[PDB]
mmCIF file of C-alpha atoms and ligand atoms in Angstrom:
data_model
loop_
_atom_site.group_PDB
_atom_site.id
_atom_site.type_symbol
_atom_site.label_atom_id
_atom_site.label_comp_id
_atom_site.label_asym_id
_atom_site.label_seq_id
_atom_site.Cartn_x
_atom_site.Cartn_y
_atom_site.Cartn_z
ATOM 1 C CA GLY A 1 82.098 66.891 83.145
ATOM 2 C CA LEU A 2 84.832 64.362 83.853
ATOM 3 C CA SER A 3 84.344 60.634 84.135
ATOM 4 C CA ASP A 4 85.487 58.688 87.177
ATOM 5 C CA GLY A 5 88.456 57.440 85.175
ATOM 6 C CA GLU A 6 89.361 60.973 84.168
ATOM 7 C CA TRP A 7 89.219 62.186 87.751
ATOM 8 C CA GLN A 8 91.409 59.247 88.684
ATOM 9 C CA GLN A 9 93.970 60.450 86.147
ATOM 10 C CA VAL A 10 93.713 64.016 87.445
ATOM 11 C CA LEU A 11 94.320 62.965 91.015
ATOM 12 C CA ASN A 12 97.102 60.633 89.938
ATOM 13 C CA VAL A 13 98.798 63.552 88.186
ATOM 14 C CA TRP A 14 98.133 65.694 91.212
ATOM 15 C CA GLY A 15 100.157 63.275 93.324
ATOM 16 C CA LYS A 16 103.165 64.399 91.298
ATOM 17 C CA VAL A 17 102.425 68.000 92.235
ATOM 18 C CA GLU A 18 101.842 67.188 95.896
ATOM 19 C CA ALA A 19 105.276 65.608 96.149
ATOM 20 C CA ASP A 20 106.747 69.052 95.543
ATOM 21 C CA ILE A 21 103.992 71.624 95.753
ATOM 22 C CA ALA A 22 106.316 74.600 96.186
ATOM 23 C CA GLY A 23 108.546 73.624 93.280
ATOM 24 C CA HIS A 24 105.577 73.060 91.011
ATOM 25 C CA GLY A 25 103.899 76.229 92.227
ATOM 26 C CA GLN A 26 107.037 78.270 91.695
ATOM 27 C CA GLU A 27 107.496 76.949 88.179
ATOM 28 C CA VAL A 28 103.835 77.494 87.318
ATOM 29 C CA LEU A 29 104.025 81.129 88.358
ATOM 30 C CA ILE A 30 107.372 81.661 86.661
ATOM 31 C CA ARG A 31 105.987 80.142 83.466
ATOM 32 C CA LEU A 32 102.978 82.451 83.762
ATOM 33 C CA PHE A 33 105.024 85.563 84.482
ATOM 34 C CA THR A 34 107.695 84.978 81.848
ATOM 35 C CA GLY A 35 105.263 83.780 79.194
ATOM 36 C CA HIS A 36 102.747 86.553 79.898
ATOM 37 C CA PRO A 37 104.513 89.484 81.572
ATOM 38 C CA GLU A 38 101.265 91.437 81.836
ATOM 39 C CA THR A 39 100.208 88.918 84.490
ATOM 40 C CA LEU A 40 103.062 90.027 86.731
ATOM 41 C CA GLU A 41 101.513 93.497 86.847
ATOM 42 C CA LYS A 42 98.530 92.086 88.727
ATOM 43 C CA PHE A 43 100.762 91.183 91.679
ATOM 44 C CA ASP A 44 101.864 94.233 93.618
ATOM 45 C CA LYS A 45 104.129 91.886 95.565
ATOM 46 C CA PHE A 46 105.876 90.457 92.490
ATOM 47 C CA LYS A 47 105.964 93.371 90.028
ATOM 48 C CA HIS A 48 109.426 94.267 91.372
ATOM 49 C CA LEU A 49 110.744 91.015 89.879
ATOM 50 C CA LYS A 50 112.583 92.126 86.748
ATOM 51 C CA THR A 51 114.340 88.873 85.822
ATOM 52 C CA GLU A 52 113.565 85.185 85.977
ATOM 53 C CA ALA A 53 116.587 84.745 88.251
ATOM 54 C CA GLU A 54 114.921 87.116 90.714
ATOM 55 C CA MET A 55 111.677 85.170 90.346
ATOM 56 C CA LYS A 56 113.504 81.891 90.930
ATOM 57 C CA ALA A 57 115.226 83.326 94.009
ATOM 58 C CA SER A 58 111.996 84.749 95.443
ATOM 59 C CA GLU A 59 110.887 82.787 98.470
ATOM 60 C CA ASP A 60 107.634 84.710 98.525
ATOM 61 C CA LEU A 61 106.894 83.616 94.962
ATOM 62 C CA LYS A 62 107.384 79.994 95.979
ATOM 63 C CA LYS A 63 105.182 80.645 98.977
ATOM 64 C CA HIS A 64 102.459 82.051 96.791
ATOM 65 C CA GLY A 65 102.879 79.147 94.405
ATOM 66 C CA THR A 66 102.151 76.868 97.338
ATOM 67 C CA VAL A 67 99.042 78.877 98.176
ATOM 68 C CA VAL A 68 97.813 78.723 94.591
ATOM 69 C CA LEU A 69 98.390 75.034 94.069
ATOM 70 C CA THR A 70 97.048 74.145 97.499
ATOM 71 C CA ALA A 71 93.846 75.927 96.593
ATOM 72 C CA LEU A 72 93.720 74.293 93.177
ATOM 73 C CA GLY A 73 94.404 70.869 94.634
ATOM 74 C CA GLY A 74 91.609 71.300 97.137
ATOM 75 C CA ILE A 75 89.291 72.135 94.262
ATOM 76 C CA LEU A 76 90.466 69.244 92.107
ATOM 77 C CA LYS A 77 89.985 66.770 94.925
ATOM 78 C CA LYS A 78 86.303 67.695 94.955
ATOM 79 C CA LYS A 79 85.985 66.086 91.508
ATOM 80 C CA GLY A 80 83.807 68.900 90.252
ATOM 81 C CA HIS A 81 81.753 69.378 93.423
ATOM 82 C CA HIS A 82 83.705 72.514 94.192
ATOM 83 C CA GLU A 83 81.108 75.295 94.319
ATOM 84 C CA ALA A 84 81.985 76.271 97.893
ATOM 85 C CA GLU A 85 85.733 76.145 97.227
ATOM 86 C CA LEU A 86 85.531 77.922 93.881
ATOM 87 C CA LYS A 87 83.107 80.718 94.857
ATOM 88 C CA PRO A 88 85.514 82.758 97.042
ATOM 89 C CA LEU A 89 88.318 82.388 94.518
ATOM 90 C CA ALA A 90 86.139 83.495 91.634
ATOM 91 C CA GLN A 91 84.950 86.396 93.752
ATOM 92 C CA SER A 92 88.374 87.482 94.953
ATOM 93 C CA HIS A 93 89.922 87.144 91.525
ATOM 94 C CA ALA A 94 87.149 89.080 89.829
ATOM 95 C CA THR A 95 86.478 91.760 92.419
ATOM 96 C CA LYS A 96 89.733 92.287 94.278
ATOM 97 C CA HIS A 97 92.534 91.069 92.037
ATOM 98 C CA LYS A 98 90.752 91.867 88.759
ATOM 99 C CA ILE A 99 92.100 88.825 86.934
ATOM 100 C CA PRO A 100 90.621 88.361 83.452
ATOM 101 C CA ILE A 101 89.591 84.832 82.621
ATOM 102 C CA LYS A 102 92.262 84.913 79.912
ATOM 103 C CA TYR A 103 94.889 84.826 82.637
ATOM 104 C CA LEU A 104 93.249 81.726 84.073
ATOM 105 C CA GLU A 105 93.611 80.190 80.634
ATOM 106 C CA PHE A 106 97.270 81.221 80.704
ATOM 107 C CA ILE A 107 97.867 79.605 84.067
ATOM 108 C CA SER A 108 95.984 76.481 83.025
ATOM 109 C CA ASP A 109 98.260 76.025 80.052
ATOM 110 C CA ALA A 110 101.241 76.867 82.246
ATOM 111 C CA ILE A 111 100.318 73.992 84.539
ATOM 112 C CA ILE A 112 100.317 71.615 81.575
ATOM 113 C CA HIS A 113 103.636 73.005 80.412
ATOM 114 C CA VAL A 114 105.182 72.638 83.859
ATOM 115 C CA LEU A 115 103.957 69.078 84.210
ATOM 116 C CA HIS A 116 105.618 68.099 80.951
ATOM 117 C CA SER A 117 108.737 70.019 81.891
ATOM 118 C CA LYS A 118 109.080 68.379 85.299
ATOM 119 C CA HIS A 119 107.820 64.921 84.301
ATOM 120 C CA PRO A 120 108.873 64.460 80.669
ATOM 121 C CA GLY A 121 107.602 61.151 79.410
ATOM 122 C CA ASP A 122 105.601 60.678 82.597
ATOM 123 C CA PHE A 123 102.636 62.907 81.772
ATOM 124 C CA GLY A 124 100.869 60.739 79.263
ATOM 125 C CA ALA A 125 98.310 61.716 76.700
ATOM 126 C CA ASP A 126 95.434 60.427 78.821
ATOM 127 C CA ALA A 127 96.729 62.306 81.859
ATOM 128 C CA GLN A 128 97.095 65.501 79.851
ATOM 129 C CA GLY A 129 93.579 65.086 78.509
ATOM 130 C CA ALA A 130 92.113 64.606 81.956
ATOM 131 C CA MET A 131 94.094 67.422 83.553
ATOM 132 C CA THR A 132 93.168 69.751 80.722
ATOM 133 C CA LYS A 133 89.499 68.888 81.138
ATOM 134 C CA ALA A 134 89.724 69.462 84.872
ATOM 135 C CA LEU A 135 91.319 72.865 84.366
ATOM 136 C CA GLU A 136 88.725 73.720 81.752
ATOM 137 C CA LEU A 137 85.985 72.826 84.214
ATOM 138 C CA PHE A 138 87.658 74.986 86.848
ATOM 139 C CA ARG A 139 87.987 77.876 84.417
ATOM 140 C CA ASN A 140 84.469 77.423 83.108
ATOM 141 C CA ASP A 141 82.925 77.513 86.556
ATOM 142 C CA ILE A 142 84.972 80.599 87.351
ATOM 143 C CA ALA A 143 83.790 82.067 84.056
ATOM 144 C CA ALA A 144 80.192 81.537 85.112
ATOM 145 C CA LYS A 145 80.835 83.461 88.304
ATOM 146 C CA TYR A 146 82.644 86.171 86.355
ATOM 147 C CA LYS A 147 79.625 86.507 84.087
ATOM 148 C CA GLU A 148 77.327 86.788 87.091
ATOM 149 C CA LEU A 149 79.533 89.631 88.355
ATOM 150 C CA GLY A 150 79.790 91.273 84.948
ATOM 151 C CA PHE A 151 83.547 91.069 85.185
ATOM 152 C CA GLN A 152 85.670 91.170 82.051
HETATM 153 C C1 HEM B 201 94.762 78.076 89.273
HETATM 154 C C2 HEM B 201 94.369 79.348 89.287
HETATM 155 C C3 HEM B 201 94.469 80.198 90.560
HETATM 156 C C4 HEM B 201 94.294 79.852 91.836
HETATM 157 C C5 HEM B 201 93.858 78.493 92.413
HETATM 158 C C6 HEM B 201 94.542 81.010 92.644
HETATM 159 C C7 HEM B 201 94.465 81.047 94.006
HETATM 160 C C8 HEM B 201 94.729 82.157 94.751
HETATM 161 C C9 HEM B 201 94.599 82.223 96.183
HETATM 162 C C10 HEM B 201 94.166 81.033 97.056
HETATM 163 C C11 HEM B 201 94.926 83.452 96.554
HETATM 164 C C12 HEM B 201 94.914 84.035 97.972
HETATM 165 C C13 HEM B 201 93.449 84.148 98.419
HETATM 166 C C14 HEM B 201 92.649 85.088 97.557
HETATM 167 O O1 HEM B 201 93.058 86.260 97.419
HETATM 168 O O2 HEM B 201 91.590 84.659 97.047
HETATM 169 C C15 HEM B 201 95.265 84.195 95.368
HETATM 170 C C16 HEM B 201 95.649 85.499 95.365
HETATM 171 C C17 HEM B 201 95.939 86.196 94.242
HETATM 172 N N1 HEM B 201 95.806 85.750 92.951
HETATM 173 FE FE1 HEM B 201 95.343 83.896 92.381
HETATM 174 N N2 HEM B 201 94.889 82.058 91.821
HETATM 175 C C18 HEM B 201 94.862 81.577 90.540
HETATM 176 C C19 HEM B 201 95.148 82.283 89.407
HETATM 177 C C20 HEM B 201 95.542 83.581 89.394
HETATM 178 C C21 HEM B 201 96.025 84.290 88.236
HETATM 179 C C22 HEM B 201 96.138 83.678 86.829
HETATM 180 C C23 HEM B 201 96.321 85.527 88.631
HETATM 181 C C24 HEM B 201 96.902 86.711 87.838
HETATM 182 C C25 HEM B 201 97.448 86.625 86.624
HETATM 183 C C26 HEM B 201 96.055 85.632 90.034
HETATM 184 C C27 HEM B 201 96.244 86.758 90.783
HETATM 185 C C28 HEM B 201 96.205 86.782 92.143
HETATM 186 C C29 HEM B 201 96.597 87.890 92.972
HETATM 187 C C30 HEM B 201 97.090 89.244 92.443
HETATM 188 C C31 HEM B 201 96.420 87.542 94.235
HETATM 189 C C32 HEM B 201 96.726 88.369 95.485
HETATM 190 C C33 HEM B 201 98.191 88.073 95.798
HETATM 191 C C34 HEM B 201 98.663 88.864 96.986
HETATM 192 O O3 HEM B 201 98.766 90.106 96.860
HETATM 193 O O4 HEM B 201 98.937 88.258 98.050
HETATM 194 N N3 HEM B 201 95.578 84.417 90.479
HETATM 195 N N4 HEM B 201 95.133 83.381 94.266
#
């Protein structure tokens, strides 16, 4: 449950991401994969990436980063009214990709890390609070769908 002012902060922060969705998406995934190498194993199409240099050079990783952040941005712009947008992602990530909710926590924190890394001094405490709450809401609603599906 975010206030109007918190959603305003979220969407203000998101404008930073939308200016360079592929660069943000790439860095989010690289942060996820390098911080939590087990997550790489969930991607048949990225498990060949042995080094961060290879990850950085991967155009397909940037492409997927764009897909991920485009989806997330579409969800965030719903300001919590995202059941229709979230449902297929929860279902695909539980049933097809088999992504534990822990990895969604990892990527949520990776987003925060990337925002500070790319916008140092420009991702204020209020913005971090609002973005964190929005990612918690996202993760929590996914978690509810995971529970429905019995997925761990
Ligand atoms: C912000 C959180 C995430 C968003 C918005 C997101 C979004 C997406 C989207 C839109 C797709 C393609 C459509 C689909 O298959 O449903 C996808 C595919 C996929 N996602 Fe995610 N995802 C997120 C987090 C994760 C995490 C944390 C993992 C694993 C650690 C993961 C693993 C995968 C895999 C393996 C695929 C299939 C990739 C392929 O083979 O093309 N996702 N994701």
